Short mmCIF file of C-alpha atoms and ligand atoms in Angstrom, two decimals:
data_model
loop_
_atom_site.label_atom_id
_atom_site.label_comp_id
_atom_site.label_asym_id
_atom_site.label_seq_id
_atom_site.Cartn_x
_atom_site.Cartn_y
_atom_site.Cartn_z
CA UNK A 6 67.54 82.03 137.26
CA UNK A 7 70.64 83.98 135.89
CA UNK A 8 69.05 86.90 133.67
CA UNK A 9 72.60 88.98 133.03
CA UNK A 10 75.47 86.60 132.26
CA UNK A 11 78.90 87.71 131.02
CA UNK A 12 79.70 87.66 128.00
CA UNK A 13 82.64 86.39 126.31
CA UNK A 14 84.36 89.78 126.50
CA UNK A 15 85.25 90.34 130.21
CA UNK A 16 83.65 93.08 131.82
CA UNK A 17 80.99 93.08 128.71
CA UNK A 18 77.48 91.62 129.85
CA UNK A 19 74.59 90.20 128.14
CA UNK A 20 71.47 89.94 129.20
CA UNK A 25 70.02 90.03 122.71
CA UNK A 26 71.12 93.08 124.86
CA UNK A 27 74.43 93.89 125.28
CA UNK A 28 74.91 95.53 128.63
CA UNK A 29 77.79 97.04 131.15
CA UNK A 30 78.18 97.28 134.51
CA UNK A 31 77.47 101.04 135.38
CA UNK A 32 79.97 102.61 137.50
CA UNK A 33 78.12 105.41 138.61
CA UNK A 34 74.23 103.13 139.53
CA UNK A 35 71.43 105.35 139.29
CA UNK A 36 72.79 107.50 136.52
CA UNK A 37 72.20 107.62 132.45
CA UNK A 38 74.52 109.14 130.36
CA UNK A 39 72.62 109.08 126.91
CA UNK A 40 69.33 107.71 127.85
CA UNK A 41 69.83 104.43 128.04
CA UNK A 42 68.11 101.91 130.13
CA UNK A 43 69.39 100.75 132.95
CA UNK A 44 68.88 97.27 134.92
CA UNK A 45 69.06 96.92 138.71
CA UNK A 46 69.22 93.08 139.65
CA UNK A 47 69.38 93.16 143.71
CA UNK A 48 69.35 89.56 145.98
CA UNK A 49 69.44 89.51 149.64
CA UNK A 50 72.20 91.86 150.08
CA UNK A 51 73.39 92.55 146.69
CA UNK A 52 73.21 94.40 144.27
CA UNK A 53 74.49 95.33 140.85
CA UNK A 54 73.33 97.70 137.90
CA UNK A 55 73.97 97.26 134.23
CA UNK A 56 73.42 99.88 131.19
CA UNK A 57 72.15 98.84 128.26
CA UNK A 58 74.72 99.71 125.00
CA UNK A 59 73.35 100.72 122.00
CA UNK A 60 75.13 99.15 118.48
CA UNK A 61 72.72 101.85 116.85
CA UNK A 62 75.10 104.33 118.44
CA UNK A 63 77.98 102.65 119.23
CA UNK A 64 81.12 101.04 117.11
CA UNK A 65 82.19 98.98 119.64
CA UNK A 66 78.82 97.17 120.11
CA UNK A 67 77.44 96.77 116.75
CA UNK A 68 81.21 95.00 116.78
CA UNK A 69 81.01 93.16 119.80
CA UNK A 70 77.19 91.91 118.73
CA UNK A 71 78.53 91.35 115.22
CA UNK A 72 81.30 88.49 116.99
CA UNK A 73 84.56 90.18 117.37
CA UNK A 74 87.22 88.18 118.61
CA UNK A 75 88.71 90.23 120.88
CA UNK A 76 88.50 94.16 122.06
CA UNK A 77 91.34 94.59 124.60
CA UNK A 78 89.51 96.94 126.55
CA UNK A 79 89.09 94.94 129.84
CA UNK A 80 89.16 95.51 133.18
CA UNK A 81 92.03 97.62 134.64
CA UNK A 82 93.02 98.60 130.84
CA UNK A 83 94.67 101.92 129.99
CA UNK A 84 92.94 103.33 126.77
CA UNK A 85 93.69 106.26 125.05
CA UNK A 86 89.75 107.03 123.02
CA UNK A 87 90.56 108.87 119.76
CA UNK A 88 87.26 110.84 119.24
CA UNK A 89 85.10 110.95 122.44
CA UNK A 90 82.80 112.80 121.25
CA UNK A 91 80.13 113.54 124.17
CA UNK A 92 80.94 110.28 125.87
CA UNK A 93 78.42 107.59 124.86
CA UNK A 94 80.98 104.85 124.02
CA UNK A 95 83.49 106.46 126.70
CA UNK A 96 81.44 105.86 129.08
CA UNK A 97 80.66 102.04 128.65
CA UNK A 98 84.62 101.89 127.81
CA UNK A 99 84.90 103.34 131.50
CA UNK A 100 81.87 100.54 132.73
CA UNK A 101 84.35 97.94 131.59
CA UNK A 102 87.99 98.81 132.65
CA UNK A 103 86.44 99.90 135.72
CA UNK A 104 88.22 101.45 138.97
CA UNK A 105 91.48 100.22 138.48
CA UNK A 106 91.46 101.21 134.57
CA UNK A 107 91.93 104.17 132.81
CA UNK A 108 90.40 106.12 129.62
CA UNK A 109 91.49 109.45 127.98
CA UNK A 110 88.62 110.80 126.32
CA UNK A 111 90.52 112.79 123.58
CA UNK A 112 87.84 115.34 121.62
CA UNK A 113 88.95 118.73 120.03
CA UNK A 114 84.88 119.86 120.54
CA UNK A 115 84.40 122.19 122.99
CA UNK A 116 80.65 121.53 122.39
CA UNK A 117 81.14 117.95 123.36
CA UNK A 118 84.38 118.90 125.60
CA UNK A 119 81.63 120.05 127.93
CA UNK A 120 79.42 116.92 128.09
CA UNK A 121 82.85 115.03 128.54
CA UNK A 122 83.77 117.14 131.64
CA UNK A 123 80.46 116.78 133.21
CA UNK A 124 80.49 112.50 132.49
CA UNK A 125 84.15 112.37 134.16
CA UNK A 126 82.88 114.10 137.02
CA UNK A 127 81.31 110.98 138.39
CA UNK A 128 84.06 108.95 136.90
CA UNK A 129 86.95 109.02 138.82
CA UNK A 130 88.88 107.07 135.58
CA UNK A 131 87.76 109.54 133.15
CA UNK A 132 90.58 112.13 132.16
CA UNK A 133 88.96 114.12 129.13
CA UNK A 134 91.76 115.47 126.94
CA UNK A 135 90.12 118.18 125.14
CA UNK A 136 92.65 118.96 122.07
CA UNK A 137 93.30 117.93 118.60
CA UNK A 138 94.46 114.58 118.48
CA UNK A 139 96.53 115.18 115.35
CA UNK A 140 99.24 117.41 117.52
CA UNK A 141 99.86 114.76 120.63
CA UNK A 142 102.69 117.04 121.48
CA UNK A 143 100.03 119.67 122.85
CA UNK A 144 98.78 117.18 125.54
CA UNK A 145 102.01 113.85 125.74
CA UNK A 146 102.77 115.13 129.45
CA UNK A 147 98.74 114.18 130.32
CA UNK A 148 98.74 110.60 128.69
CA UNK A 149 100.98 107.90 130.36
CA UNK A 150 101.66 105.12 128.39
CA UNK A 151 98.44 103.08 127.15
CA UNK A 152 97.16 99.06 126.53
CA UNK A 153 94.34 100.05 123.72
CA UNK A 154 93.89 102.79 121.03
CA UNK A 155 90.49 103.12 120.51
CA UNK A 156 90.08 105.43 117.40
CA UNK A 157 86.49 106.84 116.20
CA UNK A 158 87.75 110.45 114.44
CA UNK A 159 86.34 109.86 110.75
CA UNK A 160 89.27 111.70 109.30
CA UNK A 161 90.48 111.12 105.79
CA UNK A 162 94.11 111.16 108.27
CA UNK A 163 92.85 108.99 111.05
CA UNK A 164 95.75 106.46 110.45
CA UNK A 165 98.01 108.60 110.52
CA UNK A 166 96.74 110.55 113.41
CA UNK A 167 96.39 106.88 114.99
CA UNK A 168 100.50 106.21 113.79
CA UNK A 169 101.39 109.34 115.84
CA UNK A 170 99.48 108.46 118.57
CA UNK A 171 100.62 104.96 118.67
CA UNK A 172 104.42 105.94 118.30
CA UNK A 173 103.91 108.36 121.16
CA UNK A 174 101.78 106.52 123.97
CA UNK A 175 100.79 102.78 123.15
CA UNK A 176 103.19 100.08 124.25
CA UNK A 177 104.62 97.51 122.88
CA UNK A 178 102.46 94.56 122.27
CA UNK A 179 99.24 96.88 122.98
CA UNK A 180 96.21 96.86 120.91
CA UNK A 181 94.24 99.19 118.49
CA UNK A 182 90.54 99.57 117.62
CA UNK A 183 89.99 101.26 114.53
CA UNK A 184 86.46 103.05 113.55
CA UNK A 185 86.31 103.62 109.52
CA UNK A 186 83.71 104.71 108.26
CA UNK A 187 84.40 104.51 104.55
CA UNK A 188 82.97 107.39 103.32
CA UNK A 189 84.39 109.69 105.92
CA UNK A 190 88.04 108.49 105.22
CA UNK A 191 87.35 108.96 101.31
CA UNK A 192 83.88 109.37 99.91
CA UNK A 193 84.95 108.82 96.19
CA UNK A 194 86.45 105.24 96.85
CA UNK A 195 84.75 101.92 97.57
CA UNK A 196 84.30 100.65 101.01
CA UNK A 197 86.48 97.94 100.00
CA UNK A 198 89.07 100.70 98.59
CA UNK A 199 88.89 102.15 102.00
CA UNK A 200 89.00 99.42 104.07
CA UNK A 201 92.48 97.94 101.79
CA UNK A 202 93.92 101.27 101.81
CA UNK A 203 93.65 102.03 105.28
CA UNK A 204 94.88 98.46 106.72
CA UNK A 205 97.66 98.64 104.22
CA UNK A 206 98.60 101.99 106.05
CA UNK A 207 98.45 100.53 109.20
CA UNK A 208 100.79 97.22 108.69
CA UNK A 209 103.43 99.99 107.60
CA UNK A 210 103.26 101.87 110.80
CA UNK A 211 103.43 98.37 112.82
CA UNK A 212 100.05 98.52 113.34
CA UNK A 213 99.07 94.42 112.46
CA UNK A 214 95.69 94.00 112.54
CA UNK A 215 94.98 90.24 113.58
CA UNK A 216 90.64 91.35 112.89
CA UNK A 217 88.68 93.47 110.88
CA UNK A 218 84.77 92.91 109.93
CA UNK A 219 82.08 95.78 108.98
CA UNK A 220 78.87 96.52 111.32
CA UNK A 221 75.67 95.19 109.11
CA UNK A 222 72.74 95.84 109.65
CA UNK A 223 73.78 98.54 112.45
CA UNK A 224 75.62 100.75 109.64
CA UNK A 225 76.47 100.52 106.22
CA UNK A 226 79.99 100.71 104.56
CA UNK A 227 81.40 101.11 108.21
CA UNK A 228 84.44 98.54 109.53
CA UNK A 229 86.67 97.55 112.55
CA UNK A 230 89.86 96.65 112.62
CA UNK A 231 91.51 95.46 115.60
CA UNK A 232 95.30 94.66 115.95
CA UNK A 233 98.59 94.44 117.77
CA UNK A 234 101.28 97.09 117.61
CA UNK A 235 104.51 95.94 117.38
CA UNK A 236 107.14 98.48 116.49
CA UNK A 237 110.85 97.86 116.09
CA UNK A 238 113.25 99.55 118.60
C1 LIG B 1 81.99 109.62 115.03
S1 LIG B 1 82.23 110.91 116.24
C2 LIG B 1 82.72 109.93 117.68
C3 LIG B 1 81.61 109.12 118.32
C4 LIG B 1 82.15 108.46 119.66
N1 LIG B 1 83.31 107.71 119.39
C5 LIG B 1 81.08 107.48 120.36
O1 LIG B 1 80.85 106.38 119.81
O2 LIG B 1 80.58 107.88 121.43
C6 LIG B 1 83.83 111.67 115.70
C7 LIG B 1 84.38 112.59 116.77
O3 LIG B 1 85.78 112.83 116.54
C8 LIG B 1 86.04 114.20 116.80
N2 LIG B 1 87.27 114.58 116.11
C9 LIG B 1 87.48 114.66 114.77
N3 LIG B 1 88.71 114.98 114.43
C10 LIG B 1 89.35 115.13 115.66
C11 LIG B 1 90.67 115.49 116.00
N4 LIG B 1 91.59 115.84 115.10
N5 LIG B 1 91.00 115.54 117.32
C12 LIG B 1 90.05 115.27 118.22
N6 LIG B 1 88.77 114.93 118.01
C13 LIG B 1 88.48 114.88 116.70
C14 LIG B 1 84.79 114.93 116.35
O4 LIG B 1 84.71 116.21 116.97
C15 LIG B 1 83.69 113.96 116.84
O5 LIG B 1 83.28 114.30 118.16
#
């Protein structure tokens, strides 16, 4: 009997609870539960991912097409925050990948520190991602933008990003939650405005879909960046 199959999404798990591998077994980083399956000489532990607290799996649960964080991915993560989401971003790109954990918090800076400390590809950037010229000679160039800020700017701090460290033909992950980007417009209002912004800056998104019943007025869009030369 196979009780933790992969999911569709490589390096995401399933087992409905969506689960990652942990890279650091025997350690929680938020209080989540964690699953030990051993056989014979294996082993392997999985951490169970919250959608009530994370984007990315009230996205993943609500069937996203695709997320672009895989294994061995570079992502730069736009609003890290005290790492919950980092860290099952760093569960799936794994050794060989890489994630910038970009918070201007101290408070959280702190958490984020401690978290990369048992994860070697955890670099936490802590500085305000609307200046990228205060930390460009940390970031080499990135596959995925993951953004979670819940700026009235976030596109445009996303843009600068983007222009500055994602390359061509990489991939963006947009968090908007509608009344943090402008709490006078509709969600739909939001939602328009923002993607409109975001096909001017090259930023196509090829998904976008909101996270009910996790949250409320609260969307994704995913897409491709493809700017001219
Ligand atoms: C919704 S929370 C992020 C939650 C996180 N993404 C998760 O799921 O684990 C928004 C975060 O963005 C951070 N933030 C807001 N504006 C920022 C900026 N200009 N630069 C860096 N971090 C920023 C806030 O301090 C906060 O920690």
């Amino acid at each position: 009997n196979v009780m933790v199959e992969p999911h569709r999404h490589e390096g995401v798990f399933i087992c409905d609870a969506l689960v990652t591998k942990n890279l650091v077994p025997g350690e929680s980083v938020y209080g989540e539960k964690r699953v030990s399956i051993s056989e014979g000489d294996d082993k392997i532990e999985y951490r169970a991912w919250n959608p009530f607290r994370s984007k990315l799996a009230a996205a993943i649960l609500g069937g996203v097409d695709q997320i672009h964080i895989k294994p061995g991915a570079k992502v730069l993560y736009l609003g890290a925050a005290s790492g919950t989401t980092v860290s099952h971003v760093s569960d799936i790109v794994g050794p060989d990948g890489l994630v910038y954990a970009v918070e201007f918090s101290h408070r959280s800076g702190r958490d984020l520190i401690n978290l990369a400390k048992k994860r070697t590809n955890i670099i936490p950037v802590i500085e305000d991602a609307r200046h990228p010229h205060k930390y460009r000679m940390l970031i080499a160039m990135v596959d995925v933008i993951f953004a979670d800020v819940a700026q009235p700017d976030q596109t445009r701090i996303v843009a600068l990003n983007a222009h500055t460290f994602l390359r061509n033909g990489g991939h963006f992950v947009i968090s908007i939650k509608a009344n943090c980007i402008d709490s006078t417009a509709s969600a739909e209002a939001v939602f328009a405005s923002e993607v409109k912004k975001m096909q001017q800056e090259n930023m196509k998104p090829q998904e976008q879909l909101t996270l009910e019943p996790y949250e409320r007025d609260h969307a994704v869009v995913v897409g491709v960046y493809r700017p001219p030369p």
